[model samples]
Target: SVFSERTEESSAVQYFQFYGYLSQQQNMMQDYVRTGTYQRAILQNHTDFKDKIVLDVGCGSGILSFFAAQAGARKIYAVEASTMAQHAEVLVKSNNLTDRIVVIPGKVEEVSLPEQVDIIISEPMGYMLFNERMLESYLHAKKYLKPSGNMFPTIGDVHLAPFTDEQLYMEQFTKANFWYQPSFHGVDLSALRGAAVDEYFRQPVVDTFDIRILMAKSVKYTVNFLEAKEGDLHRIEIPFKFHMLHSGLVHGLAFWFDVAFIGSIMTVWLSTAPTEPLTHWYQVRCLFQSPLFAKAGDTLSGTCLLIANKRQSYDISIVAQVDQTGSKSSNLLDLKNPFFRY
Candidate 1:
């Protein structure tokens, strides 16, 4: 019934299964098939499970379960709540680790554990931070882990960076404006269209800076797989820096992440920049009220406030204000179109 209620477009399905445009971009931005984070975490899992048990919670494809079996785990439980659980079971058998690994086709909370586990491994990060309810499962699994047990991706942090690009906005929204006004009106809208283009085609500023994901001074909340409670907010502050066409519109800020578990082997990665060629997950464009135009040299200062949704699930909402230094438009229309969000 739950699966029936879900759309294929849900972020959980897209991001977790490596589906869609984000998947394509992820392919280019990071080496997954070979140096996949799961594989990297596999190596980082220094615990010798020769006779110990391991639990792979939310193990979508059973990669973590295989990793555990490879580490000589006496027994491993790979739990998944999706239909893919069937595939994982087959994969485990094909890999000939069926005896050592057990694929459970149910939610971690509902499916009972055989016994306490020594370690838990999973890839449960949601877009931004807490878009999906998977994090709650991770916390529940923690209570079932032994005192000495550990979680892979034990240490993870979010990051924020500033970039500028206009191709996307122009291609997606602006270019249409040009053609629509000309053809739909049964009038020579060319001259007026060109004039309107020049008047409205606002360029963006490329004064770039970087902001750490969780370290921002105004970060209203920070959720960790291992350590985060309901209704918690962390102050976050970061600078925006861009190195591109010298200037352009900032479609919006995109985010990616890095994680470390067990030893110091870290799965460091960057989210594909929306300012550049957008991959997937259309950039969470923080479109500005007034287009910011910057020349060869300019700097941007941004303040963002992140808040957590206080429901059964963890969802974060971000509010950001950005200003370009040393540039002020003199003739800017104060009474701009009310509906012009971009």
Candidate 2:
């Protein structure tokens, strides 16, 4: 029953196996902006880390643990659910840091800490800021922290905006046109194109794109880690209203998230926005089944809800009503697409 209760989209074994690969760990460590921002956030706040006991919720390659040690942390517990913990142990020994860091090969939720930690650090964010649902595990691990302790990312902010990308939109639907061929091997398959088009826009896509494609103002939703509870992440609803910037076709809804590290002495921020340098978690776009046209000064109001689903990921629903002038009014948007992580 405990195991079943922990089953969230990905099974514990499957989740650990995914992170167990060295190539995957390499892919994460190679993210310059991501690793760089973390290092700066940790090292620049040496005063906060000095002589402190720290806990790393998902210390993949023990990188953050090493950073904490370098920042004068007295002791650190690097808890990893994957076999990568073996390598982290080797890394700790080889670097002569075995005295300061313990590579615990176990899930943070199941593991026990010898003493309460003064700091908790992790990079658990995923696409749309909740794809992997790792933040749930991170929050569960917070039980090992002291009352005066703090988390590295004190706050997380997810931003949503309407975008118009004619090229990208056409590229997707154009593949559906494969079924539009009048004669494919002497078979008329044009009828299948409609189904193909519907399938194409069914799931959210993780990608990076030109910010110029954006067509309106953005709405932001925040998750304050210090004030967050276990239930806070169960269901998230963001009410957004965007004023059209110019006349264009709304092809999709774009997302980006920023996290802030508010240490005792300093504060630092990391962003995965289109304007910032690219990271592994670039941006997640929810493409519409049909594009809607809007002119300048028009209003677009929508309520986006992320319902947590254990069998898959989240059921992301975006239902919008556009206020346009004249008699060309019709359906603007109504989409509830499932965005899976595994």
Candidate 3:
């Protein structure tokens, strides 16, 4: 559905390069030598698998199907609604699970299942969990699965962490906020605003913001409905220890996973082996609570909330409330000057 205007095949082409980059990074970071999630989600889901049918939605690379075979699934409906379905077919054949795992090279909504399935397994996590809209495929497939059927990665939660970083906020976000001001006749119209006048002579770095992280459980829910009180600013710091395997433009940070289904066992995935090299975006961000001009070593404290989402067709939301207190008034900028004239 990402590109309804174009043929499904072509739509996938649009994201192929992006996905390739992601896959490469995945391999470099979490290229598991063995099927980590498969061993747990399928092989361990049932005690007796002599004659069980399983459905693997979005069966990329046919890894889950192979796991179903290992678990003794009598038949598997491997659904893949992307161009890689051909590659998955080849991999399935190469793995010699063709007789057991049948590849369905189309979206789950369009595919017809030969029989009811006893289990439904899928890996539909996109950036931030809802960005990919993979849940629509699985939710549609749920109708075909038998009652009480198994769902791999049975439980998912959006985890949030309240952290403090003065340098990162100042350098990355705050700096951008100050620089992206719209130009008015090349006269720096923003400077004419009272804020620029009030704080013109003072340094903008003295400005601060409180950011909070909201953990969303699913991608198909809105975050605005949930509410919380803002806390006061405090000292804060978070140390991010990254072990990057290779180096590239720190395009983004990913949260890889291999959750256990036995009882909502969630495994937090960081792309690094015990002895891997550093990654591209292997850096920690520090933020301040109260708006304050901060130097490299200033410590700021804040809070973050991880909220759960209601499972829906296609939606995801966030609710973050970070507060800043104990702001030092010594370096407060005087915006009343010509330079800050908006």
Candidate 4:
């Protein structure tokens, strides 16, 4: 359990703990709005919302609701589970869209709508795309939506690429290495050095990176939320192969995602790839204990296994092999001991 303080807390408790941070909510609002990713996707497919009912799950600040309202939705149900809903309500009223957009401060699963909706919109992605477990809420919203209802950003994709972060690795190594120094302050702390090193690989690093450090990228997973089930995310394995363009050190892997809004006539892809413009989500960097030294024309092959843990986080296991000239070396990043926190 991520919140160890509450021994028997439910998922709801864990949910609020992570999302209740106003700073995080504000950052997501600003990033999603400024990027115009969802807004443009919704507005461009105006026909779906025009004179039709719509639903916005996890409607933080009601931005997606506003988008639907602007698209001429006849009615919009904006469901939020945090205090941000109050601000969303204020914004809805200020924009005079209150009549069309109703902000409901509750979980989507518990909320009720008067009628089936024609469209469902939400930004439910968490770290690595399923951290907060909000995708289940989107799936739950399907019951309130019409059979033909469309989901904004209908398709979601996960991409993986070999990565190198020499500076970060060195920093963590130094922190752990210092604890191994003999008789620092006349105290022997060599026994605690291993714990210090272990801490570095306990969590996934969320930061921007230069795509040039990445080799070939492989699509790990793709899902249509409307058609996806809870079981779909339980355990996933992605096998990838990348041809090294140049000699470099491979520290680990980098991950990002893309969401697509598919309309009757057009499709819009909003990518969070390292090569694309930066977003709040940035990129998920999974590091290894030691770097793999490789050369140009070498091939890297790996299997990425993501297992859903009880804490609503994931345990990632990566087994990769680097082929140099005809010789191969394998690296294993077993993350089962500490489930990587979203």
Highest lDDT: give the candidate number: 2
Q: Which lDDT tens digits does candidate 3 get at residues 276-304? A: 33332222111222333322223322222
- Per-prediction RMSD in angstroms? 8.9, 3.4, 12.7, 4.1
| Cα lDDT over the full model 1 | 0.50
- Worst lDDT 10-window in candidate 3: 224-233
Q: Give the TM-score of candidate 1.
A: 0.60
Candidate 2, clashing residue pairs? none
RMSD of 1: 8.9
Clashes of each: 26, 0, 39, 0
Q: Give the TM-score of candidate 2.
A: 0.91
**Per-residue lDDT value at 6 in model 1:** 29
- Point out the higher-scoring one by TM-score: 1 or 2: 2
Cα lDDT, all candidates:
0.50, 0.82, 0.43, 0.75
- State model 2's lDDT: 0.82
Off by over 4 Å in 3: 1-30, 33-35, 46-49, 174-260, 263-342
**TM-scores for all predictions:** 0.60, 0.91, 0.54, 0.87
Task: Tell me which residue pairs clash in candidate 4.
Answer: none
